[PDB]
Design a protein around this nucleic acid. Structure first.
Lengths: 428, 428
DNA sequence: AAAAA
DNA sequence: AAAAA
DNA sequence: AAAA
DNA sequence: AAAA
């Protein structure tokens, strides 16, 4: 009888609750919401973050980060998505990915794993794109797992391991750093105009080692700019950063009179400005919890080197600003550090005059309840930069909620051109 | 000695002259200029357009169009361009295309053909992208010639054939237009809720036949928008439209006392607003000359049908707005028109009450000097919409400059971060 | 932006 | 946006 | 007339 | 000091 061809703008409420938990230094999705082209989106999240109960009182605060991204479906499917919308009703169904059989094999995607073992691929593919563009180190290779079932238990359960806060050892110079550059002069002659050309080519190589390892960085150096559709990267909408604090509880019985237990409870807000959605896609929110990288057995570089030369100590501007980067070992910074090839990296020529490390007294070593890196970070450069959550197990009491937990309410309001429920159920 | 690492913004002059010629209704490149990321570009073209001398006086003015487009190199090379800029000095040279051996095998690209037979592919590939996105009919297939040498003599010498100005026969309904839609009702029963669903699916199919045959049109119907990098299309900067006029010259000798000769000479301006160049690429300018599509042996539809029914003549709003599109033949509009399958197309139900054709008296038939389509447009629908320049040969006197010629000065001013000539030649 | 400026 | 508000 |  |  009466065929409907259009719809008014209606206020849709997409608010819901979230019960979240995770580990230290792993990225995990906490909320998502699919969107349609032409929508007007707004988000506001309010909740409280908690850590597991501590073995002692409060010593060090933790840092919490919240992120929101928008990913069009065209970035995930490509040409398949283009033909999908042009065909219309008789379009081919989109491809899928395979998941595991347990209930928690997709916890990093913020959803319960369906019993069928099959789910759409836009959440898994959007997670990889975010990680490879914003969170991993620029010099390490991308993650290219095809299906969620290809991950190990740790990655699927809690998320991918992220990088420590920047220090001398956790933010070294990239591995493709050269300390020498050779030329092909003659046996008894040299071209000096050719020498000038050699320095010019070395300058462009050093630019791409320190600043420009991505395509959008190269364009930015010329003074241009690239849209997020040019390099197929997710669009960041909002970032929030805050510190979590709490209070202490005192024991009052015979045995525990004089000891204390700390609990962390912090309220937060994550507000995203109004956004106009240009195409069909998804909007995802993620969280990250980290501690400042304090190590017990770390000392000053001048203390660790022992025998000091004029270059080390004088701080002469002519020598500091004209020498190639120096290669140092982990032994020079940590007790029992290594000397082999895997314990070697390169730093600035006088970096020790621009920072001072933190000191932990030997009375605090091997003491439960203090969030510390006991000893030194182990492994090669890749394992040294990435955070390992199992090293923080000595700070918390064993519980089923991991190392941190939160409860938040996401206030989502969208203006959508969709027919009402009454229109959908009445034939005439 | 002294190595330079930066440069000031300098005013570069890229002005040059152009001597242009072509045929009626063929797209041809008249100017181009490569650009660098971060540039500030501005263009202003001033010149005069001429036609070949006419066999008689001035009767009909012609229409001239000028276009300017910007095409990044990333649209032409894709991932190859991305790796080119990330590698730096030691990058692999870009691929090339093969050209012909004659001097005029690349005239449609606005350049003289080099004697080596090899040229970069960014001009040829940018020309195809412009034609497939803005000039061909939406329902005809794309042009995908790999090399300039794969074209025929006519296309390479003058350009691709474009479409006539919109009329009843030159702008028909797309060939994928249906006049019926079937359902699968029962032998003695019908579902009426299923009938409502059938109309909904028919509406979406008709939307994609009349309005949305490109991806960016589908997104626009939802109320969203797509950048030119999403569908990899050229960016239009400016369009100019004007008519060309002239005057007449009188003969004064014994034989030609009383006859006249018309010449067309029109000055024009094509100004492009200041543009910020975001990436490396090229900026191209093209021209198009067309005549209004007047045919000698064309008559009214009511005259050609002969026997008139109530639906044809009454103009009743209920019948006009509720009937499927009607299929008519070329015989109903042109003398000696066809009736076979290739001379059939579909129009609106009462299109003849919304326009009136032009009348040419029989005294003007087969008379040299008048720009007309003698008789009818021949061929199938594809050949009927595209303009054929050989039909206008009877209007001009034979000359080496084709059917139109022009002489213009392009004022190009760009702000570029490039070192001076003195910096480039002095070592210190 | 085909339809006098 | 790690570095009291 | 529907957000009955 | 260069746009000598």
């Amino acid at each position: 009888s009466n065929v409907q061809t259009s719809a008014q703008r209606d206020r849709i409420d997409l608010s819901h609750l979230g019960f979240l938990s995770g580990q230290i230094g792993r990225l995990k999705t906490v909320s998502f919401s699919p969107v349609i082209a032409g929508d007007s989106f707004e988000l506001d999240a309010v909740g409280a973050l908690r850590l597991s109960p501590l073995r002692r009182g409060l010593a060090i605060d933790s840092n919490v980060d919240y992120f929101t991204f928008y990913i069009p479906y065209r970035h995930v499917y490509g040409q398949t998505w283009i033909d999908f919308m042009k065909d219309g009703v008789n379009a081919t169904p989109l491809p899928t990915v395979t998941t595991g059989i347990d209930m928690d094999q997709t916890a990093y995607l913020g959803t319960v794993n369906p019993t069928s073992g099959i789910m759409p691929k836009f959440l898994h593919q959007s997670y990889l794109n975010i990680y490879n563009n914003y969170f991993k180190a620029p010099w390490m290779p991308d993650r290219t797992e095809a299906n969620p079932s290809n991950l190990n238990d740790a990655d699927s359960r809690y998320g991918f391991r992220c990088c420590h806060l920047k220090t001398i050892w956790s933010a070294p110079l990239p591995p493709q750093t050269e300390i020498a550059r050779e030329m092909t002069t003659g046996s008894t002659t040299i071209d000096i105009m050719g020498l000038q050309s050699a320095y010019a080519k070395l300058h462009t190589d050093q630019e791409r080692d320190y600043f420009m390892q991505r395509y959008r960085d190269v364009i930015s150096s010329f003074g241009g700019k690239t849209s997020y559709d040019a390099d197929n990267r997710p669009l960041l909408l909002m970032r929030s950063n805050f510190w979590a604090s709490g209070y202490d509880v005192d024991g009052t019985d015979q045995t525990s009179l004089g000891q204390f237990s700390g609990r962390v409870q912090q309220t937060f807000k994550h507000a995203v400005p109004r956004f106009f959605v240009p195409e069909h896609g998804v909007i995802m929110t993620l969280a990250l919890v980290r501690f400042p990288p304090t190590c017990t057995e770390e000392h000053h570089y001048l203390i660790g080197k022992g025998s000091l030369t004029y270059t080390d100590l004088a701080g002469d501007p002519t020598l500091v600003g004209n020498l190639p980067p120096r290669e140092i070992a982990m032994e020079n910074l940590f007790r029992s550090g290594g000397t082999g090839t895997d314990q070697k990296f390169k730093v600035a020529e006088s970096i020790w005059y621009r920072y001072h490390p933190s000191y932990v007294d030997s009375a605090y070593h091997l003491l439960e309840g203090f969030p510390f890196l006991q000893g030194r970070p182990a492994g090669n450069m890749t394992e040294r930069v990435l955070i390992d959550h199992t090293k923080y197990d000595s700070c918390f009491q064993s519980t089923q909620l991991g190392q941190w937990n939160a409860q938040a309410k996401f206030n989502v309001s969208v203006y959508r051109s969709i027919p009402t429920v009454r229109d959908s159920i009445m034939t005439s």
